[PDB]
Amino acid sequence: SKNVVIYADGVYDMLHLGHMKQLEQAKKLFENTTLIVGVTSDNETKLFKGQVVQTLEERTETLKHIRWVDEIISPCPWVVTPEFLEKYKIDYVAHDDIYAWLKRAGKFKATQRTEGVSTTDLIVRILKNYE
Amino acid sequence: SKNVVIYADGVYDMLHLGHMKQLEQAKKLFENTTLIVGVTSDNETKLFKGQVVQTLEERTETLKHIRWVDEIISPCPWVVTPEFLEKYKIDYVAHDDIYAWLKRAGKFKATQRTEGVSTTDLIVRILKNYE
């Protein structure tokens, strides 16, 4: 009944069914949720992850089409802080420890992955037809 | 105010932002809509289109994550017929003539494409980094 605010951040480069299923899990952690998604900036992703295929605008615009996504913070901070959680009134952080302080506060929620549905998975499936 | 039933069929192989934007247009043709999406069977697609990368289950499961999609008919008929439109109480068929009878009945609604956002577009973008 009481609306719970859930926050899930990530790069969301080349969104595939694995991401979508993870967004669905996060959205359905509780009966009544607001799922906020954070999309990392191009510069920080390149710098910390190393690379990024799609721009922030492309990655955000794709997520805007996903049913479970209620709100998008784009770009989002690379590091979640308690101040950030306070400002957006976030109840839980969904992710698949740097995250130890979130568990200690009961704010951490795990979401699981699905394999075999990515862009790479589909290119392999196509090229197996020819090589 | 009055709810309008919109129907958009297709293969929806390798769903990308172009498809999603087209589903959004179809969903927002009127203030109050139900967007029904038809997903073609593997056999008919292979036979008439020629090929298909993702199975019906994969293509349907992906569309299930798309916000604009209210209902899915999977598989859908390869050919829309008036009987089909009657059975599901469809008011309009959204598409991007075989379709002449739909225009004559005022049931035809065009939706436009977006280019440069496909899987192929993104592989090219990656490989341009290496070749």
Automatic annotation (TrEMBL), chains A, B:
Organism, by scientific name, is Plasmodium falciparum (isolate 3D7)
**Sequence positions that bind phosphocholine:** V11, K49
* The protein, known as: choline-phosphate cytidylyltransferase
Please list the residues that bind CMP: V11, Y12, H19, D96, T114
- Annotated family: Belongs to the cytidylyltransferase family.
Q: Where is the Cytidyltransferase-like domain?
A: 7-123
